[PDB]
Amino acid sequence: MKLLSTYRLQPMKFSEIRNRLDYFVELGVTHLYLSPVLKARPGSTHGYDVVDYNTINDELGGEEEYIRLIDEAKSKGLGIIQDIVPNHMAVHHTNWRLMDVLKKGRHSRYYNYFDFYEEEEKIRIPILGDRNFKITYVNDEPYLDYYGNLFPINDEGRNYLNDIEKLLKVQYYELVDWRDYPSYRRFFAVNELIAVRQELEWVFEDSHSKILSFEVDGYRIDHIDGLFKPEEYLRRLKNKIGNKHIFVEKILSIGEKLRWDFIDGTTGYDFLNYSNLLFTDNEDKMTEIYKNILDIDLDELVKETKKKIIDTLFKHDIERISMMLGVNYEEIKEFLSCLKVYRTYITENDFRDEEIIRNCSQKVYESMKKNVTAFMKLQQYMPAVFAKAYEDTVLFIYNRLISLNEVGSDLHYYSISCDKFHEFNLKRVGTLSFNATSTHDTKFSEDVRMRISAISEIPDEWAKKVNEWHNILNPNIDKNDEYRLYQTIVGSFDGFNNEYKERLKAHMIKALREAKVHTDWVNVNTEYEKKMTYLIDKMFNNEKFMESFLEFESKIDKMGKVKSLSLVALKITSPGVADFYQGLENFRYLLTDPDNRRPVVFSELPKRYEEGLFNNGRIKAYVTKVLLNLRKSMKDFFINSEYKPLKLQKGLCGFMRGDKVLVIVKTLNRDYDIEIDGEYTDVITDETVRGRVKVDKLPLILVK
């Protein structure tokens, strides 16, 4: 099927997806973007923790149900884009490849399959809080059982089942303190995920045999940046799959181009952030307000956070490579904190990135030329530094306007002009790269971000409400966390009820622990966390605050809905492939994983335009449906047609696609009238329009 739009599903039984196919057809999507489908750890909710590359997940219905879904989708005119996970597997006893290594050590065929630290005599596995061991059997074979975590026993160890300490001494692995370093490359700092050596061709072949055997339309590659040689992997993949699509999950910096021109693109955090930057207002006022809550230098914060992340999460991993490079740990740590991209892509015959490296350190550049392989190892940790320090710490501290605090965001950027957005789109004509606005990993859903950005349109009223609320509630949390909380409730508000109350508490504690200012995941400050949760309880029972909030929130909700509809219009009518996170056909207000993992629910889609659609909230589904179906009916027009910017006043953004489609959207909640040449049909309202057209609550998608 020809690719125009994707609908991302979190894990769902294949039979349940199959029975919803008519819905997806009606909505107008061309492709289902499925979560990983290979056998994972028991009851995995996400599928990123693979235990066997050879088997389709039985919990989801298994291989025959998968094939059935693929075939019935095809017959209904829908294709499949399949998420795959090459970088790592799960450390679990159902991972038979890994168990083979733990049982046989270096003599296992699979020792090279995983990225073990070869200088280590034994494979160190950080897990112990005590020495309380037992023996538990799996299919008649004895396992070392540490609180249900099972490890195999070699032939020598099996003579010592009644003497566990002696059994452990002769093992090829060593169980160590849970705070210690593992002797393998992980996914980021996740001890339970061990990295796979995709650079070895037999490992590529072995891990891709099953998943590539099915009649899907394309693939989405989890964490491409973890790979030793990502380009080579992508070339190997392209060679095996024929003409099927390849998309990568990869975070680009502003002005950074995807390194690999021979794949289809990324999952679209570039579009997410460029479009996000169109909806903010009043930088000066919002900056001034925040100066009085917390005045800090962003660059200093980022640099220091990166150094801290390296010391606390990756010290052994980086020390090892520093030793290989002949550069001291403190200098490599400093170099890593200097990088302004997720990673570089040096290979043994590609040194394009050497000036990026040199710019940060002359000595590091010199060490790279002398030890290319060692530096290529360093590259695999570069994204972990960036993600853990920036996405998972900095984004929870710098609270000027948290709609900007998103995966793929550079906090130096507060806004961009409509013209800068056009420059981005102009270069994208013909691309199949995704236009994303919400994902399973975004800090917020699109509709939350649109609400929070709407705050910046009325900053005087906002400042007034913030002060008023402070005086009503008398919070004993610090000013930055208070400002974070106010923005979060405004963005994510779903009624003063218990369900939402507990979601908000859960999220705020996560936000506090990520920021690591007053509390963290290792050492929980239960007292300070109680202050935050007590404040939220107080908010949901204090009558004055709720009345004040609901008056402000009624405004923000309306403003957010207008901005959201504009964003949807931009996503569908721009070059690129329109991506939808499950449920975002409707206004859906999601916070950070796990909040954004709540089950999708399906409703009947609206059948025609009615003025009441905006107020009852069904407008988003209608707009999504009509525009996706327009995209679909025009074949490849939205992919390949000319992109022609319009010159419009501030707060409006517009363009033509070819000579057929005129698009004008409001990024700000203000009154606008536009003059149009000749007659057009408004595809949302189904009205024939001419002359002066009002831009009210809806985007204008006008067809000639």
PDB file of all heavy atoms in Angstrom, residues 28-50:
ATOM      1  N   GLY A  28      -8.965   7.239   7.511  1.00  0.00           N
ATOM      2  CA  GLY A  28      -8.183   7.667   6.355  1.00  0.00           C
ATOM      3  C   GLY A  28      -6.686   7.360   6.388  1.00  0.00           C
ATOM      4  O   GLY A  28      -5.958   7.752   5.481  1.00  0.00           O
ATOM      5  N   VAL A  29      -6.215   6.671   7.428  1.00  0.00           N
ATOM      6  CA  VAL A  29      -4.799   6.286   7.490  1.00  0.00           C
ATOM      7  C   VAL A  29      -4.492   5.208   6.452  1.00  0.00           C
ATOM      8  O   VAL A  29      -5.368   4.417   6.091  1.00  0.00           O
ATOM      9  CB  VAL A  29      -4.352   5.808   8.898  1.00  0.00           C
ATOM     10  CG1 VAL A  29      -4.390   6.961   9.895  1.00  0.00           C
ATOM     11  CG2 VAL A  29      -5.202   4.644   9.378  1.00  0.00           C
ATOM     12  N   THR A  30      -3.258   5.193   5.960  1.00  0.00           N
ATOM     13  CA  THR A  30      -2.844   4.186   4.985  1.00  0.00           C
ATOM     14  C   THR A  30      -2.127   3.013   5.640  1.00  0.00           C
ATOM     15  O   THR A  30      -2.157   1.889   5.115  1.00  0.00           O
ATOM     16  CB  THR A  30      -1.944   4.775   3.860  1.00  0.00           C
ATOM     17  OG1 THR A  30      -0.731   5.315   4.417  1.00  0.00           O
ATOM     18  CG2 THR A  30      -2.683   5.864   3.085  1.00  0.00           C
ATOM     19  N   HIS A  31      -1.481   3.286   6.775  1.00  0.00           N
ATOM     20  CA  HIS A  31      -0.635   2.313   7.463  1.00  0.00           C
ATOM     21  C   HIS A  31      -0.834   2.273   8.969  1.00  0.00           C
ATOM     22  O   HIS A  31      -1.045   3.310   9.620  1.00  0.00           O
ATOM     23  CB  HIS A  31       0.846   2.569   7.152  1.00  0.00           C
ATOM     24  CG  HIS A  31       1.241   2.150   5.775  1.00  0.00           C
ATOM     25  ND1 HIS A  31       0.804   2.812   4.651  1.00  0.00           N
ATOM     26  CD2 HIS A  31       2.015   1.128   5.337  1.00  0.00           C
ATOM     27  CE1 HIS A  31       1.289   2.214   3.576  1.00  0.00           C
ATOM     28  NE2 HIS A  31       2.035   1.196   3.966  1.00  0.00           N
ATOM     29  N   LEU A  32      -0.755   1.062   9.509  1.00  0.00           N
ATOM     30  CA  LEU A  32      -0.658   0.829  10.945  1.00  0.00           C
ATOM     31  C   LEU A  32       0.812   0.698  11.307  1.00  0.00           C
ATOM     32  O   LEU A  32       1.569  -0.041  10.656  1.00  0.00           O
ATOM     33  CB  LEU A  32      -1.424  -0.442  11.349  1.00  0.00           C
ATOM     34  CG  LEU A  32      -2.904  -0.495  10.957  1.00  0.00           C
ATOM     35  CD1 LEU A  32      -3.550  -1.773  11.511  1.00  0.00           C
ATOM     36  CD2 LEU A  32      -3.647   0.755  11.438  1.00  0.00           C
ATOM     37  N   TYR A  33       1.208   1.450  12.326  1.00  0.00           N
ATOM     38  CA  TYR A  33       2.576   1.494  12.818  1.00  0.00           C
ATOM     39  C   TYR A  33       2.576   0.680  14.123  1.00  0.00           C
ATOM     40  O   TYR A  33       2.121   1.135  15.169  1.00  0.00           O
ATOM     41  CB  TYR A  33       2.974   2.978  12.927  1.00  0.00           C
ATOM     42  CG  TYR A  33       4.218   3.379  13.685  1.00  0.00           C
ATOM     43  CD1 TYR A  33       5.254   2.476  13.969  1.00  0.00           C
ATOM     44  CD2 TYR A  33       4.372   4.709  14.082  1.00  0.00           C
ATOM     45  CE1 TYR A  33       6.398   2.897  14.666  1.00  0.00           C
ATOM     46  CE2 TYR A  33       5.490   5.134  14.766  1.00  0.00           C
ATOM     47  CZ  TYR A  33       6.496   4.234  15.062  1.00  0.00           C
ATOM     48  OH  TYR A  33       7.591   4.701  15.755  1.00  0.00           O
ATOM     49  N   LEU A  34       3.017  -0.574  14.022  1.00  0.00           N
ATOM     50  CA  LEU A  34       2.882  -1.507  15.141  1.00  0.00           C
ATOM     51  C   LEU A  34       4.086  -1.514  16.078  1.00  0.00           C
ATOM     52  O   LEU A  34       5.224  -1.412  15.627  1.00  0.00           O
ATOM     53  CB  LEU A  34       2.635  -2.937  14.633  1.00  0.00           C
ATOM     54  CG  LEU A  34       1.460  -3.235  13.693  1.00  0.00           C
ATOM     55  CD1 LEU A  34       1.401  -4.727  13.437  1.00  0.00           C
ATOM     56  CD2 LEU A  34       0.119  -2.716  14.266  1.00  0.00           C
ATOM     57  N   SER A  35       3.818  -1.681  17.374  1.00  0.00           N
ATOM     58  CA  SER A  35       4.857  -1.913  18.385  1.00  0.00           C
ATOM     59  C   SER A  35       5.586  -3.233  18.109  1.00  0.00           C
ATOM     60  O   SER A  35       5.067  -4.075  17.381  1.00  0.00           O
ATOM     61  CB  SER A  35       4.237  -1.938  19.790  1.00  0.00           C
ATOM     62  OG  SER A  35       3.737  -0.663  20.119  1.00  0.00           O
ATOM     63  N   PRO A  36       6.792  -3.415  18.686  1.00  0.00           N
ATOM     64  CA  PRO A  36       7.560  -4.638  18.433  1.00  0.00           C
ATOM     65  C   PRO A  36       6.760  -5.920  18.740  1.00  0.00           C
ATOM     66  O   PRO A  36       6.010  -5.982  19.724  1.00  0.00           O
ATOM     67  CB  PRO A  36       8.777  -4.489  19.359  1.00  0.00           C
ATOM     68  CG  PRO A  36       8.921  -2.997  19.552  1.00  0.00           C
ATOM     69  CD  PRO A  36       7.510  -2.480  19.580  1.00  0.00           C
ATOM     70  N   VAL A  37       6.922  -6.927  17.896  1.00  0.00           N
ATOM     71  CA  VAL A  37       6.068  -8.111  17.948  1.00  0.00           C
ATOM     72  C   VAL A  37       6.826  -9.408  18.280  1.00  0.00           C
ATOM     73  O   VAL A  37       6.216 -10.474  18.352  1.00  0.00           O
ATOM     74  CB  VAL A  37       5.287  -8.300  16.614  1.00  0.00           C
ATOM     75  CG1 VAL A  37       4.252  -7.181  16.419  1.00  0.00           C
ATOM     76  CG2 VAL A  37       6.254  -8.390  15.411  1.00  0.00           C
ATOM     77  N   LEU A  38       8.143  -9.314  18.470  1.00  0.00           N
ATOM     78  CA  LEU A  38       8.936 -10.494  18.844  1.00  0.00           C
ATOM     79  C   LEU A  38       8.819 -10.809  20.331  1.00  0.00           C
ATOM     80  O   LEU A  38       8.604  -9.914  21.155  1.00  0.00           O
ATOM     81  CB  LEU A  38      10.411 -10.354  18.424  1.00  0.00           C
ATOM     82  CG  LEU A  38      10.665 -10.248  16.909  1.00  0.00           C
ATOM     83  CD1 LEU A  38      12.151 -10.062  16.600  1.00  0.00           C
ATOM     84  CD2 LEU A  38      10.124 -11.471  16.178  1.00  0.00           C
ATOM     85  N   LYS A  39       8.969 -12.091  20.658  1.00  0.00           N
ATOM     86  CA  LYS A  39       8.773 -12.587  22.016  1.00  0.00           C
ATOM     87  C   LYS A  39       9.585 -11.750  22.993  1.00  0.00           C
ATOM     88  O   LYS A  39      10.799 -11.574  22.824  1.00  0.00           O
ATOM     89  CB  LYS A  39       9.184 -14.059  22.107  1.00  0.00           C
ATOM     90  CG  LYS A  39       8.879 -14.729  23.447  1.00  0.00           C
ATOM     91  CD  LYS A  39       9.450 -16.161  23.466  1.00  0.00           C
ATOM     92  CE  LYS A  39       9.245 -16.828  24.818  1.00  0.00           C
ATOM     93  NZ  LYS A  39       7.786 -16.949  25.093  1.00  0.00           N
ATOM     94  N   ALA A  40       8.894 -11.223  23.996  1.00  0.00           N
ATOM     95  CA  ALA A  40       9.508 -10.360  25.001  1.00  0.00           C
ATOM     96  C   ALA A  40       9.379 -10.970  26.392  1.00  0.00           C
ATOM     97  O   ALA A  40       8.819 -12.058  26.547  1.00  0.00           O
ATOM     98  CB  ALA A  40       8.864  -8.962  24.958  1.00  0.00           C
ATOM     99  N   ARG A  41       9.875 -10.263  27.407  1.00  0.00           N
ATOM    100  CA  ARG A  41       9.727 -10.720  28.793  1.00  0.00           C
ATOM    101  C   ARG A  41       8.250 -10.892  29.135  1.00  0.00           C
ATOM    102  O   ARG A  41       7.416 -10.132  28.633  1.00  0.00           O
ATOM    103  CB  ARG A  41      10.370  -9.735  29.764  1.00  0.00           C
ATOM    104  CG  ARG A  41      11.878  -9.757  29.741  1.00  0.00           C
ATOM    105  CD  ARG A  41      12.439  -9.006  30.937  1.00  0.00           C
ATOM    106  NE  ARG A  41      11.980  -7.619  30.986  1.00  0.00           N
ATOM    107  CZ  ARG A  41      12.223  -6.788  31.995  1.00  0.00           C
ATOM    108  NH1 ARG A  41      12.923  -7.200  33.048  1.00  0.00           N
ATOM    109  NH2 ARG A  41      11.767  -5.539  31.954  1.00  0.00           N
ATOM    110  N   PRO A  42       7.924 -11.881  29.994  1.00  0.00           N
ATOM    111  CA  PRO A  42       6.532 -12.176  30.330  1.00  0.00           C
ATOM    112  C   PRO A  42       5.794 -10.916  30.753  1.00  0.00           C
ATOM    113  O   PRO A  42       6.299 -10.155  31.581  1.00  0.00           O
ATOM    114  CB  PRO A  42       6.650 -13.136  31.520  1.00  0.00           C
ATOM    115  CG  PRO A  42       7.955 -13.777  31.356  1.00  0.00           C
ATOM    116  CD  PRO A  42       8.860 -12.759  30.724  1.00  0.00           C
ATOM    117  N   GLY A  43       4.632 -10.693  30.143  1.00  0.00           N
ATOM    118  CA  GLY A  43       3.803  -9.512  30.412  1.00  0.00           C
ATOM    119  C   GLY A  43       4.420  -8.151  30.112  1.00  0.00           C
ATOM    120  O   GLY A  43       4.017  -7.138  30.706  1.00  0.00           O
ATOM    121  N   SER A  44       5.395  -8.102  29.200  1.00  0.00           N
ATOM    122  CA  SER A  44       5.917  -6.806  28.769  1.00  0.00           C
ATOM    123  C   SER A  44       4.756  -5.987  28.224  1.00  0.00           C
ATOM    124  O   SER A  44       3.908  -6.509  27.491  1.00  0.00           O
ATOM    125  CB  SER A  44       7.001  -6.948  27.696  1.00  0.00           C
ATOM    126  OG  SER A  44       7.328  -5.678  27.142  1.00  0.00           O
ATOM    127  N   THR A  45       4.721  -4.711  28.590  1.00  0.00           N
ATOM    128  CA  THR A  45       3.674  -3.818  28.107  1.00  0.00           C
ATOM    129  C   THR A  45       4.086  -3.028  26.864  1.00  0.00           C
ATOM    130  O   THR A  45       3.282  -2.267  26.334  1.00  0.00           O
ATOM    131  CB  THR A  45       3.242  -2.815  29.180  1.00  0.00           C
ATOM    132  OG1 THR A  45       4.359  -1.989  29.548  1.00  0.00           O
ATOM    133  CG2 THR A  45       2.666  -3.544  30.409  1.00  0.00           C
ATOM    134  N   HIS A  46       5.325  -3.209  26.402  1.00  0.00           N
ATOM    135  CA  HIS A  46       5.871  -2.382  25.315  1.00  0.00           C
ATOM    136  C   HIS A  46       6.619  -3.145  24.212  1.00  0.00           C
ATOM    137  O   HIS A  46       6.736  -2.650  23.089  1.00  0.00           O
ATOM    138  CB  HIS A  46       6.755  -1.251  25.893  1.00  0.00           C
ATOM    139  CG  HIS A  46       7.795  -1.733  26.858  1.00  0.00           C
ATOM    140  ND1 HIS A  46       8.917  -2.419  26.454  1.00  0.00           N
ATOM    141  CD2 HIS A  46       7.874  -1.647  28.209  1.00  0.00           C
ATOM    142  CE1 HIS A  46       9.646  -2.736  27.510  1.00  0.00           C
ATOM    143  NE2 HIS A  46       9.035  -2.275  28.589  1.00  0.00           N
ATOM    144  N   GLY A  47       7.147  -4.326  24.531  1.00  0.00           N
ATOM    145  CA  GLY A  47       7.867  -5.151  23.554  1.00  0.00           C
ATOM    146  C   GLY A  47       9.303  -4.774  23.237  1.00  0.00           C
ATOM    147  O   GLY A  47       9.915  -5.388  22.365  1.00  0.00           O
ATOM    148  N   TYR A  48       9.860  -3.787  23.948  1.00  0.00           N
ATOM    149  CA  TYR A  48      11.255  -3.367  23.718  1.00  0.00           C
ATOM    150  C   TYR A  48      12.291  -4.227  24.445  1.00  0.00           C
ATOM    151  O   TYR A  48      13.507  -3.999  24.314  1.00  0.00           O
ATOM    152  CB  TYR A  48      11.439  -1.877  24.034  1.00  0.00           C
ATOM    153  CG  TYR A  48      10.726  -1.003  23.035  1.00  0.00           C
ATOM    154  CD1 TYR A  48       9.570  -0.305  23.392  1.00  0.00           C
ATOM    155  CD2 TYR A  48      11.199  -0.879  21.721  1.00  0.00           C
ATOM    156  CE1 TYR A  48       8.891   0.499  22.462  1.00  0.00           C
ATOM    157  CE2 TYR A  48      10.524  -0.095  20.780  1.00  0.00           C
ATOM    158  CZ  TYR A  48       9.370   0.593  21.164  1.00  0.00           C
ATOM    159  OH  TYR A  48       8.703   1.384  20.258  1.00  0.00           O
ATOM    160  N   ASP A  49      11.795  -5.205  25.203  1.00  0.00           N
ATOM    161  CA  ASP A  49      12.626  -6.130  25.977  1.00  0.00           C
ATOM    162  C   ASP A  49      12.543  -7.543  25.381  1.00  0.00           C
ATOM    163  O   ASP A  49      11.913  -8.444  25.940  1.00  0.00           O
ATOM    164  CB  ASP A  49      12.257  -6.099  27.482  1.00  0.00           C
ATOM    165  CG  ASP A  49      10.747  -6.233  27.749  1.00  0.00           C
ATOM    166  OD1 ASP A  49       9.921  -6.087  26.822  1.00  0.00           O
ATOM    167  OD2 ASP A  49      10.387  -6.467  28.928  1.00  0.00           O
ATOM    168  N   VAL A  50      13.212  -7.716  24.244  1.00  0.00           N
ATOM    169  CA  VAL A  50      13.148  -8.942  23.438  1.00  0.00           C
ATOM    170  C   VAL A  50      13.906 -10.093  24.099  1.00  0.00           C
ATOM    171  O   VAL A  50      15.028  -9.908  24.577  1.00  0.00           O
ATOM    172  CB  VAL A  50      13.754  -8.696  22.013  1.00  0.00           C
ATOM    173  CG1 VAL A  50      13.668  -9.951  21.155  1.00  0.00           C
ATOM    174  CG2 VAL A  50      13.058  -7.508  21.320  1.00  0.00           C
TER     175      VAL A  50
END
